[PDB]
A paper describes a structure:
Here we report that the 2-aminoisobutyric acid hydroxylase from Rhodococcus wratislaviensis, AibH1H2, requires manganese to functionalize a strong, aliphatic C–H bond (BDE = 100 kcal/mol). Structural and spectroscopic studies of this enzyme reveal a redox-active, heterobimetallic manganese–iron active site at the locus of O2 activation and substrate coordination. Metabolism of 2-aminoisobutyric acid (AIB) in Rhodococcus wratislaviensis proceeds via the initial, selective hydroxylation of the pro-(R) methyl group by the monooxygenase AibH1H2 to furnish α-methyl-d-serine (d-MeSer). Previously, recombinant expression of AibH1H2 in Escherichia coli enabled its structural characterization and revealed distinct mono- and dinuclear metal binding sites housed within the AibH1 and AibH2 protein subunits, respectively.
We expressed AibH1H2 in E. coli grown in M9 minimal medium supplemented with excess FeII, and subsequent purification furnished protein samples (FeAibH1H2) containing ∼3 equiv of Fe per AibH1H2 heterodimer and minimal heterometal content (entry 1). Fe occupancy in both the mononuclear (Site 0) and dinuclear (Sites 1 and 2) metal sites was evident by inspection of the anomalous dispersion maps obtained from X-ray diffraction experiments performed on single crystals of FeAibH1H2. AibH1H2 had no detectable activity upon the exclusive incorporation of iron ions. To probe whether the absence of monooxygenase activity was caused by the choice of sacrificial reductant, other commonly utilized reducing systems (e.g., NADH/Phenazine, sodium dithionite, and alpha-ketoglutarate) were explored, but none proved competent to produce measurable quantities of d-MeSer with FeAibH1H2. These results suggested that the active form of AibH1H2 could not be produced under routine expression and purification conditions typically used for nonheme iron enzymes.
Author numbering:
A (entry chain A), D (entry chain C): 29 to 378
B (entry chain B): 11 to 375
C (entry chain D): 11 to 374
The structure:
């Protein structure tokens, strides 16, 4: 029996000090010397409406999801969820100094393993990797290969170079070598303008706009040959929406037809490659929870295998984690989303 | 005085690419710029003398049958009259000249030398007016201006913008700031005064990489990626409140596809429901701006696996705001007779070929 | 009715960094912006909530003795009066606020929300005149303005620019276009119309990578790399003919160092000999604009291996346009009695400490 | 005896068709179907006053240095030069399609050997490398390592990522292990703005300003530790001036003294490291050819082992290939500049 897996929930690092027990003295001393500048991202500004919903347990500082006890008390309360994949978005990937990036990426994962995975056997997590050095990124993936509670590699939607570049192929190689799916999460290294036409002037315009950059990562991944050179690769889009996929798929397919000899190794249609190797989390649902829209978007994708359930705890979205039921009348569809589609990613039984 | 255009039995084609023949722009060029071009060429956002960062793949991305006896496709106005305007009953053919010479895409308003760029913009607008629009006013002009220097743009909209051989202001899809930036409001103001709408055509360049996350490698990435610029522009133009400030401004995204807009706008509304507080001066819900402000052209038409999805998505975007284009003489040219899927309803196709473009370009019967 | 700045026996300090105390801008801010900043912070060209993309290394890059009993270095008015203004007999010290304080340390003008940015610039200007310049008129204000929305910056220049407590207009070293671009001329016009010079201070941000060929890794790279921005902004401000259009315009490159300008300017001329014909409306040979238009601050003082090299190179730039700065309270703080090498010419030392600055700021 | 080397002269590829006898059938059919777009760069615009001096043997189109016979004729006509090192700046590095980048860089180096190196044995050339993929650049260094007529590796001044980043290390590896120095020549891939404050609006602005990127590339190379991991590396600055070096060296040394524990592996000053590892060509001289100025610039460097002779054929600069003598009173200096320093680079004897 496949388990109901929450494919995207969040741990929030209290402060960089939480890294001190998992750091060599060289970096613990120096972090304290630096008055510990915090790499807390602006992806979900902590005081904005999306940071946490009002029903979320909070700590003494009013912050949700900074301890394994609060998250587990909230996510598993109703008994519906059996497992949750934790993604910690602390901004280690925006540390420019390549050695401090590595060390902090490692301590973070160590934080995740001791303060979260060891505290509840219903939690899994992604491997935060230093994307500034693809060599270090892959070594980080090998090191956590040992612990199987780590069930995917975390990458940010906006990278320094497109993930399909040769330069980035070690990360794909290390992920496939460990049998780990690769997830892109909303977030970015911000080493260029977030769009091809410059800097968004608000977080809202930025947040809506990051779907475009996922079109580019998927085109680059497929175009450069990642799915032929690493054919076991699985990719999960996390908290980037999904209703934008069909028109992108159709145009990509149509242009592949036009440019076959430019990319001869791509012998299957990008329609088929994406339905087979791409999975998408359902939170936010972006309007697919309205009447019939969930059947309509699955019709448009050409596939009922791609959408996997998530709650995106503890963020607040216009619709709730189970409101996707209002968009379908297929019991069998809700079964792929809640249970069976995620089995392809994590092979987790209840 | 040239008459207003009239559409009756024929169609609107909102995107046609004529080219000046060699030296054809010089009569309209002050001599200091003719020399600057001989020495330096047109320096843009490349390190390349003659091409853009992504040159065309197969035979100039042109139709194989569209080459004149001598010169580039789109350079002979006879061939363009028979092969395009006559052959498809086009009665309003909006011209969008993308390069000053026998090249495919090398836009003038994108010269790093912005005094040079405004010069070639003015020359191009005088050349296409006397040489195409006035000989055959089935054609009209979308006039390129230097969006990156709003002073020279407001002046070119002022110089020629009232000419009846002019239906729209012409921009590029990529820019240094997103188009909702206050930087470009002076251009929107000058356009409202001349009762002109704005078309933004697919471009390279602009000053950033061609995606918001790195330069593309293969051609499937580069051509599919054009759509991304347009997603990012729509979001900036709507959420900045640009249309609160100019509530009669009409913009068309040209050759950015259409269907992808619909889920974009749907994601934009849905996020705003939670996060509207960050932008409390915006007067309307983001999707409510579409009907009056955001238009799109059809080429290169969307081709879903199930055809009945085309009309579904075009109605979700805004069925009144889709306008036909051919993109002649480019290789993915769209034929009015064969572009729409077999089941497509006739009321919608007739708007897209006629009424929709007529209302965007201020045409009556 | 505040008096014009009077420098006699004392010295000129062109770069002083005050910081508002927690909450102190909120008297000059609309309710909507107080709400905004509580909910969103001051978003900028990063993906980070509270810090910039190169956070400072050793204690926030502050000299460890300038921390008061409560606030951040620069936040105490009395400690700055004693540990700086008296201690070095600074008679004109120019405030350059690059942070509205509290939980945000990036310059006001670089907030990606430009409407927030102009309100932050405005509150900053009102706060630094009412809290520092007027109670202690030895300090004067370089007003931060929104260089990337010139409309808002012209409006601010016209609102407080004639105030006697205002002596300069504060920008940043990094920008989305090179400062010689027409985008910024309205701000120059509105500066000149108030007979105000403009100071561009070292900054991160701006829109591009911190070098023209990639993001730096190590702190030697980031800190040394700061001078490239300045090198880039001179070439554009000069070769654009900004100074032809604005012939009474004074610009100072604050904390970009000095020595490196000289062989840069020299290379500009040598190149311009062959290729001058690309820019025929350039009225003068490129080096000719320096003495009328381009100043620099000393700090952090260059340190050549042969100290004789220092004054040689400051003169190759332009000896009458090097002005002294402490950079109080930062760690590489330069001292007026100890900055220059023991063998430094003494007339050059006195007119940097005094003369040249009085000229840049219209002191007579 | 050490031989007089012209350390920087330029072959000018006439048109992409000139590569056709050096491509596979795939890459040559594709290049003709594509109407042969030209990646001729704008580093020296063909119609501007720097592109060629008037005294140049031009070809049937009016272009200097499109043949070996036209360059050899001019460069060696006064018997003063014994060898010349050829750098073809044809912009294969700005080919985004990475397969075509490899194929056109390979075929460029084939054209260079067959039609320049095979033509005059006084000619040396650099290897052009496709720096879009460091591992592909490495393989093309190694492909040309058997032929010692190739004496250095060409890299553009502006790159995608700084040359000190671990992504780029396979280029110094392969360069060190084939004996070759690496040169940075003015030019770039233009995948960000040429400056950190935006795009230069004129070629003159761009040309003068590219010095800034060279401070950034050296600080990157030194600080990231290339001089300690590949200690035999030599770095030639071909045609970027040189007067800017001292004030940059002085700051880089000062701040190294504070920041040293951030880069502990650099245990010698950058001052010393740059003197011992970096040579700069002499054309352009940037005004060090005025009276007494060449002595001054050598004194500010704190060394006379750096300056290496070059004409920059066929480029026209305000001062000529030997007016540098007017700057110095030492015949020892000029002996070092004219042939001894370049023995450290290439070990070429009369
Ligand atoms: Fe999430
Ligand atoms: Fe088109
Ligand atoms: Fe087209
Ligand atoms: Fe300072
Ligand atoms: Fe400082
Ligand atoms: Fe050269």
């Amino acid at each position: 029996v496949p388990a109901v897996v929450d494919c995207d929930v969040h741990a929030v690092l209290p402060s960089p000090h939480s890294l001190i027990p998992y750091l060599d003295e060289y970096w613990a001393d120096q972090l304290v010397a630096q008055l510990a500048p915090t790499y807390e991202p602006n992806y979900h500004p902590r005081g904005s409406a999306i940071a946490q919903h009002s029903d979320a347990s909070v700590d003494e500082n009013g912050r949700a999801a900074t301890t394994a006890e609060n998250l587990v008390k909230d996510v598993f309360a109703d008994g519906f969820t059996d497992f949750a994949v934790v993604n910690c978005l602390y901004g280690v990937q925006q540390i420019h100094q390549p050695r401090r990036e590595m060390a902090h990426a490692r301590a973070l994962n160590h934080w995740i393993a001791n303060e979260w995975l060891d505290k509840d056997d219903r939690l899994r997590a992604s491997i935060v990797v230093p994307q500034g050095s693809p060599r270090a990124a892959a070594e980080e993936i090998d090191f956590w290969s040992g612990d199987k509670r780590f069930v995917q590699v975390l990458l940010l939607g906006q990278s320094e170079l497109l993930y399909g570049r040769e330069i980035n192929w070690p990360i794909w190689e290390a992920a496939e070598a460990a049998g780990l799916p690769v997830t892109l999460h909303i977030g970015g290294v911000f080493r260029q303008a977030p769009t091809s036409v410059g800097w968004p002037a608000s977080h809202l315009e930025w947040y809506v706009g990051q779907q475009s950059n996922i079109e580019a990562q998927l085109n680059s991944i497929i175009s450069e040959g990642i799915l032929q050179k690493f054919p076991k690769t699985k990719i999960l889009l996390s908290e980037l929406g999904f209703n934008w996929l069909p028109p992108f798929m159709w145009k990509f397919d149509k242009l592949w037809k036009s440019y076959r000899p430019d990319i001869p190794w791509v012998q299957e249609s990008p329609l088929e490659l994406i339905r087979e190797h791409v999975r998408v989390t359902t939170s936010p649902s972006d309007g697919a929870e309205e009447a019939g829209r969930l059947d309509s978007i699955v019709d448009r994708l050409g596939s009922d295998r791609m959408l996997v359930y998530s709650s995106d705890y503890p963020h607040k979205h216009h619709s709730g984690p189970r409101d996707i039921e209002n968009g379908t009348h297929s019991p069998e569809l809700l079964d792929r989303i809640y249970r069976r589609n995620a089995f392809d990613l994590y092979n987790l039984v209840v | 005085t040239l008459p207003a255009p009239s559409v009756t039995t024929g169609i609107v084609d909102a995107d046609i690419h004529p080219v000046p023949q060699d030296g054809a722009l010089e009569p309209y060029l002050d001599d200091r710029w003719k020399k600057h071009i001989r020495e330096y060429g047109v320096r843009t956002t490349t390190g390349l003398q003659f091409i853009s960062e992504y040159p065309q793949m197969y035979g100039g991305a042109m139709r194989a049958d569209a080459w004149p006896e001598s010169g580039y496709p789109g350079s002979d106005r006879e061939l363009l009259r028979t092969q395009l305007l006559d052959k498809h009953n086009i009665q309003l053919g909006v011209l969008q000249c993308l390069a000053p010479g026998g090249q495919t895409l090398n836009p003038a308003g994108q010269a790093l030398n912005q005094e040079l760029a405004a010069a070639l913009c003015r020359a191009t607008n005088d050349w296409q007016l006397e040489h195409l629009v006035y000989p055959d006013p089935r054609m009209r002009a979308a006039i390129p201006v230097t969006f990156e220097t709003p002073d020279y743009a407001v002046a070119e909209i002022e110089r020629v913008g009232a000419d009846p051989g002019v239906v729209a202001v012409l921009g590029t899809s990529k820019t240094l700031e997103p188009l909702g930036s206050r930087k470009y409001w002076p251009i929107y103001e000058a356009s409202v005064a001349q009762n002109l709408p704005i078309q933004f055509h697919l471009s390279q360049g602009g000053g950033h990489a061609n995606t918001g996350t790195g330069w593309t490698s293969y051609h499937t990435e580069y051509h599919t990626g054009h759509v991304q610029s347009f997603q990012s522009q729509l979001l900036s133009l709507v959420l900045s409140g640009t249309f609160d400030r100019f509530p009669t401004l009409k913009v068309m995204f040209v050759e950015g596809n259409v269907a992808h807009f619909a889920p974009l706008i749907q994601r934009m509304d849905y996020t705003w429901e939670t996060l509207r507080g960050e932008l409390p001066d915006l007067q309307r819900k983001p999707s409510e701006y579409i009907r009056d402000h955001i238009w799109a052209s059809t080429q290169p038409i969307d081709e879903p696996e199930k055809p009945e999805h085309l009309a579904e998505l075009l109605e979700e975007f805004c069925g009144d705001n889709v306008v036909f284009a051919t993109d002649y003489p480019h290789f993915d040219f769209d034929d009015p007779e064969t572009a729409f899927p077999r089941s497509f309803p006739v009321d919608l196709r007739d708007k897209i070929l006629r009424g929709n473009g007529m209302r965007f370009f201020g045409v009556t019967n």
